[PDB]
Amino acid sequence: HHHHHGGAMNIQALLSEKVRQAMIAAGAPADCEPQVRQSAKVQFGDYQANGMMAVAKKLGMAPRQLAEQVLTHLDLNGIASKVEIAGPGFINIFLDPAFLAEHVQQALASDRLGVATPEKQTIVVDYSAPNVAKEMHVGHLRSTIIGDAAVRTLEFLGHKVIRANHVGDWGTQFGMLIAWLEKQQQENALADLEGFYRDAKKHYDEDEEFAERARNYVVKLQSGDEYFREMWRKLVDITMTQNQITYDRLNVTLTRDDVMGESLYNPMLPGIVADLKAKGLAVESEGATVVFLDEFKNKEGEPMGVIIQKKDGGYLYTTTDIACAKYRYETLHADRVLYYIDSRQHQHLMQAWAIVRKAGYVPESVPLEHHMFGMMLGKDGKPFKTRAGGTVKLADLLDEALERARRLVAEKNPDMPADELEKLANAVGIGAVKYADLSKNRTTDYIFDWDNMLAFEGNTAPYMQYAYTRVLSVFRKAEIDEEQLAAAPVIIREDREAQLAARLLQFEETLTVVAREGTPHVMCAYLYDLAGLFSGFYEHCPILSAENEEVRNSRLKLAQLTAKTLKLGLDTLGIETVERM
Ligand SMILES: NC(=[NH2+])NCCC[C@H](N)C(=O)O
């Protein structure tokens, strides 16, 4: 009859192939969508094919009587134990315990838990992007964390991921900095960096000559004089040096050679504007050079002339945005570019990208995705600041996270050696910072809350990290013949075992969603449901105290895969785990 095509597929994908073939065999067109999704309730099975009503409508027939025809052609032997029609023509699919058992075994044998590798793409990820004329702060936090989760996920799926740290390394803010560095290091001659920034502004307002000199040092830097360009590289180098040790504390995969600031695109800008003119897209308007876009309206209600070069001849964010996308396709050969940027930048991005398309700088087959996010708020519902109202240093936020975590872990003692107790607070504190962000739909405005993010109740990092330790504590090496276990089979007999196994095998399709939508909160929700299913499994099914050796070994393997899945999943979020707590 009908056969499988290609290689290894996850359960949802395999079922889709099978249901599609049955639909086609029943008369459905070759572009039919079975819409197989995980069931909401377990009386409805593990999966449901929901695409029947839409298919029946198109062929112009009753879904209830079409579903019975599709059932006739549907072959889930060795995959589904039971398949029945429900309601208006739903297809409830109950997974075969033998099918699940073999895939649990195959997952355990694999270092990546049997997660298939998708067709490899080159993916650029734009995130973090701190202003390097000052110490990194909370305003750059969400982008750094969410973007790095996307990076980790795409890398684990075997993609070529290019981290692009679009740092703000070319503002007027440097004129003051360069002036101060000269007034010291030169004419006068990492711990001074914090004294540096403040002492720079300390003369910005108390010396007319200095603050005038600072404004024209911007010109000299923009002129291309190698003297000021070298002093500029130096203070960027030392700032990124301070930023690296903060990234490290954050457990973020960003390094020095991921830095691609807007200064990198500067020598490209005149070429872009000149080329956009040559294409007849850019024309003069009120002294400025604009591109007219039909998709946008100005304040006058007229078609918007997007400025790519202004009257004084200077460029702006749009021009860099254009050059940036072009560069990422032409030089980096991106198949896909992801921008983790605050949602208020949407229109700016859409404008610049609309020009990118018109010029044909980036083919339409290469998506430019704005993975936008809400802003960090306080309890007041207003932008995030301290007790008074100054911008929050990331280095300070991390400091308090560790200090609060040391106390929170000292609450339940739990008494352990000194070094291990340090690693424990670090995992909990920083884990909480990152997880509290990641566990929420990025698009939503995020309200920072110390009490909730560090609680052992609900979907938080400390809960996840604790649940992981309880999973480990049942797998006691000293009481397990590991060679006998590794050779032992998985035998799924109870509904809770089958539920856990099936959920464990949905690790791949969770990753598939995260990679596609750029939404790590789907991963957070999965792990939490997984931890919950294990608990129900733990409290209802004797593991170490199982009645016989076959069940003991089988349930230990389920526990083993649960541990591996929780640790790998948390790793894709960039969350550290500990052995015990
Ligand atoms: N392509 C860019 N302009 N990237 C910089 C965006 C800034 C950063 N992603 C943020 O919103 O926190």
Round to whole Å and give the CA distance between 206 and 229: 26
Q: What residue ranges line ligand 1, CB within 6 angstroms?
A: 126-127, 129, 140, 143, 166, 324, 339-342
Nearest 5°: the CA angle 95, 542, 416 is 115
Are 159 and 120 in contact by the 8 Å Cβ rule? The answer is yes
**Given ligand 1 and candidates 140, 332, 345, 369, which is best to mutate, with the most ligand atoms within 8 Å of its CB?**
345
Find the 345 Cα to ligand 1 centroid distance in Å. 8
Residue 259 burial (10 A CB sphere; 0-12, 13-18, 19+): buried
Round to whole Å and give the CA distance between 497 and 479: 22
Nearest Cα residue to atom 2 of ligand 1: 166
Question: Side chain identity at 122, as an amino acid letter?
Answer: T
Nearest Cα residue to atom 9 of ligand 1: 341
| Phi, psi angle pair for 459, to nearest 5° | -80, 80
Are 216 and 175 in contact by the 8 Å Cβ rule? The answer is yes
Nearest Cα residue to atom 8 of ligand 1: 341
Q: Give the total residue count for the chain.
A: 581
Round to whole Å and give the CA distance between 196 and 92: 66
Query: Residue 398: which of 246, 195, 254, 194 has the closest Cα?
Result: 246
Pair of tokens at residue 510: 């969770």
Find the 128 Cα to ligand 1 centroid distance in Å. 7
Resolution in A: 2.2
Instruction: Order across the sheet with 47-49: list the strands.
Output: 36-38, 47-49, 90-95, 80-86
Find the 342 Cα to ligand 1 centroid distance in Å. 7
How many CA atoms, within 13 angstroms, populate the side-chain half-sphere of residue 504?
Answer: 32
Nearest 5°: the CA angle 451, 453, 455 is 65
E-strand stretches of 359-463: 368-370, 376-377, 446-447
Pair of tokens at residue 410: 């000292």
Round to whole Å and give the CA distance between 256 and 540: 50
In SS3 terms, 444-480 reads as CCEECCHHHHCCCCCCCHHHHHHHHHHHHHHCCHHHC
Find the 238 Cα to ligand 1 centroid distance in Å. 21
Q: Which residue has the tokens 């960039």?
A: 574
Region at 113 (left for phi over 0; alpha for psi -120 to 50; beta for the rest): left
Nearest Cα residue to atom 11 of ligand 1: 341
Find the 127 Cα to ligand 1 centroid distance in Å. 6
Are 290 and 280 in contact by the 8 Å Cβ rule? The answer is no
* Extents of the domains making up the chain: 1-115, 116-372, 373-581
Q: Which CATH architecture has domain 1-115?
A: 2-Layer Sandwich (3.30)
Instruction: Report the sign of the C-alpha dihedral through residues 25, 26, 29, 32, in that order.
Output: negative
Find the 59 Cα to ligand 1 centroid distance in Å. 48
- Residue 292 bridge partners (DSSP): 305
Strands 336-339 and 122-126: parallel
Output the DSSP codes for 309-344. E-TTS---HHHHHHHHHHHHHHTT--SEEEE--BGG
Which method was used?
Answer: X-ray
**Given ligand 1 and candidates 131, 136, 145, 166, which is best to mutate, with the most ligand atoms within 8 Å of its CB?**
166
